[PDB]
Chain length 150, copies 8
């Protein structure tokens, strides 16, 4: 990658539905070259894909939660618990962090009941789980994971 | 929205670079109709945009952090602090949650130094801030916020 | 339900021993109609009953406690523990909450000994229980659960 | 009070709409005597009133919260904060407890927004307030404060 | 007991080696009467004994500790653990408290090693023990348990 | 001090109302010598006094509390707060400890009200105080501070 | 040891590569005497050795961590866990402390991965371990354990 | 640096008082070359110095402490507090960490009093300090910061 690729990516991360023309003109380079670089970035895995950004409100996902999960210590209980958490419906993010030395899970649901049935009830039955602490998101001030180039 | 829109969205949330043909054939409907519904979903704000999914590794974003921030109580200190947190470079997510009754901030940086200079040092100077607790993400088991329809 | 029912309920939640006359006159509607609406609200479950409000002081209930209870994780240990907590004498409220992700139990007793014997000693023997934290209420600034319409 | 009064109260705490006849017959005493004792209990403040028990679901009170509030130390800041908490719409219970040495507040709302606007936003502006921690009740296993005689 | 007994006790709690004469004269009552009341207080268990107040410094008890102990929940594990804690050499106080819902243990030793060997090492082996948290007293501002009448 | 003094002290710490005869005979030494050693221990401050051991139950001291107090940092705020805590009626023990790095206060009262009025309300007004956490002692398994020689 | 030895040690703790001449002249004593005292301090174990002070940056040790570890209670689980922690590569310090009543572990690694593989993953498998909390050192303001004489 | 330098450093980190001969023979290289490489490592700052390893016991440093310090947020209060902590006598280590987002301070003293006077009392007066939590090290299982190459 070079400065050029950065400028292309900075644009694609915001709006991928621009035209080579539009982008070529903005970056000041040959359209065929731009098209080449983009194809390259994809082949190399810099660009992994293109997604439709959907507003969760539209889907009535009003019950947003962030849950911390403490794994019971023991052989591979941490690796196992991670993947189990990742496959739960509504869960879009799973991270193992240092400090609390546990898992942080980001999930979304339409309602409390949906949350209870699909997430909570299920997590409280998993073996490797010691404790969980759920924080109800009452306000999303910002959520733009797509912006990786500031 | 109807069941049809859901099927379209379920696909677009995964891969937006499919062709009307490909999607029309998969959903079993007229291409002109599909094209219409998609245009409608956009006009109505269900679909807010299309982004390029970039792998952060490729950008050397290796210092991933999740920080909780306690706001000092007082007139609008909470609303103010939120927006200040959202404008910090590298910060892609800001949430106000219940339980801890504070803010959860998701950010990414290339290094610790970058993290310190851009995020930490800056946050520790903000007035409305009482305390912060940073959790270093040592492993991302999953991060697919784009998947809103399970 | 309509605005009218709300006005009736707002009154009944405060004092149920008023007379149809008194209420009819206050709401400005036919007594037979009022009587009808009240009967309807009961049949529909809006109004579940009428209780005598007894001052706990009069019964010497001076040991008021609020206890948080952490359930040991495992198949249905949460559902089971809930109901066991609800059947303990003196316990009038049981809630499962998010944040602490546990149970909050409201109870009343005449003395510490009564509290120990009936509540504490009993709770500390239950299997599904991991930890409990009891907060001694030293002052009730307000307790009017009956007021549901503000 | 005597054993007799207890039996009367035990009944009235459950259902106050019984008839003297029904109660007299159950307690095995003269109706005029029963009527006397009840009048006495009221005059003495044992029985403070009669309420209609309304199901909160019927009023769409789905956002149930239990909030702990730490008061900033200083002359009468505790007494003041208590009463301010008690006058907030939706708040039906306020207790000062030992252990956490703070306030526990019980409130009900139709939605998160209502909760934010009426409760949270308001509490975060009060001077005497140091910190608050809100626990979202996701399940009421029991709530019968009216039962004071077990 | 009466006001008179209180005055006698208030004195004895401070200095028990006064003479009936000295006390009689101070309380303004017959020496034989005083002697009677004191004998009575003893027979009734108000006064359980007379002790020599020894300065711990003199015995080189420089390692003062206050330890909180969480008992593992289960049948009588709490009652058992209490008595086991009370019989440990150097331990002079054991209390079960509400809030932390555990045991608070007061002990004294000449050195850290003595503390480790006699107290810590021993407590960490007891079955019913879940966790312990030891606070090293670096300063005794006051310790006059003998003063029960202020 | 020598082994002999230890044996004398071990006895006096339990029961100070023994007679030189009784003690002399038990320790196997001349009564005049014993009397000398005891006088010496007093003059040297090993033995600071003799107290009457009074059972707090007899005085209706049923509200036993152990309170942790965090001092606000600043010039001598710690030294000042200590002495203020020590002069509060009912407070018999004050310790500054490491770990929590605060004060532990032992107090006794007849009732909750007495506790509130005399202790709590007063402590919550002191300037140097940041936070307090009160633990209600529901059971004294042991309290024998007088035993310094095990 | 005497004042003289202290002056010698104060110097050697800073720079051990000085010459007897240089030190003799600074301390104002015969070189043969100095040489004698140093040999003595070594034979007596005051001076245990001489080390090369290596800058960790030079070795790319950028992932510095401080981890607290709670041992599960049980026969010798504490002694065992200590030694297991001490033998982990990268771990240079292990302490058992009072307050948290656990272990504090100081370690260094080149990267997060190295940290995970060598330290974290390994610690999370040890039996006697209950919980761990890792604090990522983002800045070493000072690290001079070699200075024992201030 | 190369593999050779590593072998030299691995040795010097353990014992710096070996002779070029001894080291040359062990590493299998010319003494003049070894001498060159060592001089180079010093000039480049890999090797910053040579210290005498002194046993703290010998100096009666029996009061070992590890203190966490929370800085009050505000312009440069963190940078300032760090350096103030580093200049306190007995303090050999100061680290700013993530998780607790504070400072960890390692210090040594002969006694509790020395600890109080030199460290604690002094730290509790510093402005930028919010809270401190001291952990008394009762056992050093290992302390070999000099070993940077495992
Ligand atoms: Mg996207
Ligand atoms: Mg009622
Ligand atoms: Mg005594
Ligand atoms: Mg060294």
């Amino acid at each position: 990658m070079d400065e050029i690729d950065l400028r292309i990516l900075k644009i694609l991360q915001y709006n991928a539905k621009y035209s080579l023309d539009e982008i070529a003109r903005e970056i000041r380079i040959p359209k065929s070259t731009l098209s080449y670089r983009i194809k390259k970035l994809e082949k190399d895995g810099v660009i992994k894909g293109y997604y439709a950004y959907i507003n969760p409100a539209s889907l009535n996902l009003d019950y947003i939660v962030i849950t911390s999960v403490k794994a019971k210590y023991g052989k591979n209980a941490h690796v196992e618990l991670g993947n189990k958490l990742a496959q739960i419906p509504g869960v879009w993010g799973v991270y193992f962090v240092l400090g609390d030395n546990d898992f942080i899970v980001m999930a979304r649901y339409k309602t409390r009941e949906e949350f209870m049935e699909k997430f909570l009830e299920r997590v409280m039955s998993i073996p490797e789980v010691e404790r969980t602490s759920t924080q109800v998101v009452v306000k999303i001030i910002k959520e733009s994971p797509n912006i990786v180039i500031f």
